[PDB]
Amino acid sequence: QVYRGFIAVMKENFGFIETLSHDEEVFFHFSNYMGNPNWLELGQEVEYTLAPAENVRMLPKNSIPQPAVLETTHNGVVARPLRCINPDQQEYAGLIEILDELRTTVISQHEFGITSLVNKRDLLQKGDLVSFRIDESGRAACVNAVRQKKRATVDSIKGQFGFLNFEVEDGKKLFFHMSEVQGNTVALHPGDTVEFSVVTNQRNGKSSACNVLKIN
């Protein structure tokens, strides 16, 4: 009846709760949430009653005990992504693998969920090189993707999203949303230089992540 978990997906009028074991997802409607939906974080600890969830209650931080995260930073490659970005697969949790130098022998595997990612909105597909730490359960923690940084100039702006002078698919300009800009800056103009990373959906097209304005 009564469970506990973390917020994994937040959409328009609905969302999903990652279970306590990080191995399943529970759907819940915003009408059954006790509080403001806009004030709800990703990875937020919640307590919910099952019907399909109902009566979702937000919890204070560290209310759900979790394994301690070790200090050493490791490097790995993604094998399975989360089902939140890939509903095709059967397994829910993602998989990170530490490989040998020849990239052919598996040293160890480490599962990850929504609470394992530094950027909860980050798009981690198979083949991405990541930097992460390990918790006491063996799961991946502090997961961050290693991507080569690019830098171009802002070309245009249309509302809450614009384009850079970076050519990707069939000579197109790189898309970027204002939700990826750093600092507290409201001033972003065509001609400004930004340093960014290039993320790409393996089912469709490309985007850009974490772009900070470089103007000195």
Binding site: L70, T72, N75, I98, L99, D100, E101, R103, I107, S108
Partner: protein
């Protein structure tokens, strides 16, 4: 600051045996077994020295120690 990963050891392998096995090669700042195991060295030369001296050590019971660095 290069990590070394241990794999396929005996059942009496503890956190201390892992430290005793790898400390005569360099300064260790972090290590853990976790059911597989790893060691964090300060200098990268202490890591390359430990891999060449412990991969295939023979821990007994037909167990050969797999010691290797990670992909990059």
């Amino acid at each position: 600051f290069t990590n070394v990963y241990v794999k396929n050891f005996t059942e009496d392998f503890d956190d201390e045996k892992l430290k005793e096995f790898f400390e005569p090669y360099g300064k260790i700042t972090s290590y853990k077994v976790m059911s597989f195991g790893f060691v964090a060295f300060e200098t990268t030369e202490a890591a390359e020295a430990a891999v060449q001296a412990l991969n295939g050590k023979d821990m007994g019971e037909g167990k050969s120690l797999y010691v290797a660095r990670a992909q990059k």
